[PDB]
Amino acid sequence: PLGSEVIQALIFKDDGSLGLSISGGVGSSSFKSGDDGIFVSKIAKGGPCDNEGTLKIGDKILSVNEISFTGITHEKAVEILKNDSKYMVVVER
């Protein structure tokens, strides 16, 4: 209805995890049609990402702590998200 929305969310880790599972990436099978990118493919109920409440499944991750996630691999995104306790994630919905 509003088109692509740039949403922002600050999530704090718990038990070395952010509570979200990602899919996609450059060199990977696309999560959506002809769109490489890191997508929130799952949200663990009761986890940090769920308890914050801003992110939703299907969002393309655009940035994580000002690290551009556009044009990166799936393995690079996993390597980044598994570093710090605070995560400022910017997504497009």
Binding site: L20, S21, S23, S28, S29, S41, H74, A77, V78, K82
Partner: peptide
Amino acid sequence: NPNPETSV
């Protein structure tokens, strides 16, 4: 192409 879903 690989289609991975990684828990983070």
